[PDB]
Design a protein around this ligand. Structure first.
Ligand SMILES: [Cl-]
Lengths: 244, 243
């Protein structure tokens, strides 16, 4: 039984944009996965921006974040992203990938509780070597695209070892697009520093099905998140998951 | 001033050969605005807007386990194509699947429905009529300003039901989201002939929430698109959402 099928025709979406990477899709109803590259789908990388999901979940479950309205005041330090130089709540911190807010969450969670929770989540290699407030950006943690799918499916089903409340709040914060045809929950691909790999992970909710996606790509000459989203959407449109 | 009348919004009703009221509430400033102070307080049958309290009560009482629970199609062909299939709470709200809400109301029953509407301080709290149709042809009445009060409690998880039930219904209400705003509504799609059509909900911005409740007299055709257009023309005029 092959729960993972390879479709090399999606490689054209990478080659036409002079890029190299993987797209992994999971059809929830059919319990079947699809990818352009099975080997790369299983290669583990630094989670970087995708770590906002487990970080926020742990912060809510432990009461570091009381609710999605609690204000995290700006520290007064001027940074190069204008949207970071203001107060935020969980929703806006996710919207604008406000790394200083997530660093504050990680410091409050602390090393021991962060490690215990990643082990409880079965999250990637569960290795958090590095500064407690930067290990997902320059430390020892690694996760593959197929492991991102397994983690996101548990989140979708409220099956992670954290409160149902924390899972519902994080899914609300992940909201990125909604129209009369579909909803996309993601808010995970923004790159805040130089990394070898960029990501885009999340899911597409349809009336009678959910399609999980996890993609990663090598750093190209100039393109980034916009391109990662474009290639993923080109694949979703090819598979008739979302309309053209 | 707490309440202000803005008659310039009447241009949006006149341009579309319509009559009605738009009520807006600025959460941060605790201030309300309307084109018609009298009509803002006039109470009407809630019709499609009743899916919000009906869903909340059904979830809190365990009639609906969660937003994924499947309500299987009974195999009976109905005259709204989207009703002739299985549904969950999300899609039943999306397609205003009256037979699903009727089954919720029959399970809730008269006594619990009345007690919960009293607990919610919902409109006139009068459920006179058939338990499975009173929000469509019975005694219940609610005004646009009362819709705002009810929605504000829901937004703040302040209704006398679990926080879980409130979070699930707010998820079901999701209708639009982009990089600028989120609209939670799913309350205006009507399949049954009524004297009044509605559109109620709210717009979430980065640092504020604007609640809205509008109603209009009905001539003919699929009025939802028109109700949404008038409301959005008002939101755009007040610079709440971009042009
Ligand atoms: Cl949502």
């Amino acid at each position: 039984a092959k729960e993972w099928q390879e479709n090399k025709s999606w490689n054209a979406h990478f080659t036409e944009h002079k890029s190299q990477g993987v797209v992994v899709l999971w059809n929830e109803n059919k319990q079947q996965g699809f990818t352009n590259n099975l080997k790369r789908a299983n290669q583990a990388f630094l989670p970087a921006s995708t770590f906002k999901i487990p970080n926020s979940l742990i912060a809510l479950d432990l009461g570091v974040v009381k609710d999605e309205h609690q204000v995290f005041k700006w520290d007064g330090q001027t940074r190069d992203i204008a949207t970071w130089n203001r107060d935020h709540n969980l929703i806006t911190a996710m919207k604008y990938s406000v790394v200083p807010v997530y660093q504050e969450f990680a410091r409050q969670i602390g090393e021991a509780r962060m490690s215990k929770m990643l082990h409880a989540f079965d999250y990637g290699n569960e290795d958090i070597s590095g500064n407690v407030d930067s290990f997902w950006l320059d430390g020892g943690i690694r996760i593959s695209a197929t492991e991102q799918i397994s983690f996101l499916r548990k989140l979708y089903h409220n099956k992670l070892h954290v409160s149902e409340r924390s899972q519902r709040i994080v899914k609300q914060a992940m909201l990125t697009e909604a129209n009369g045809d579909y909803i996309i929950r993601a808010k995970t691909g923004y790159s805040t520093r130089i990394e070898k790999i960029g990501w885009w992970v999340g899911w597409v909710e349809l009336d009678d099905n959910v399609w999980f996606f996890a993609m990663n790509m090598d750093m190209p000459t100039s393109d980034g998140l916009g391109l990662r989203q474009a290639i993923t959407k080109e694949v979703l449109k090819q598979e008739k998951i979302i309309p053209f």
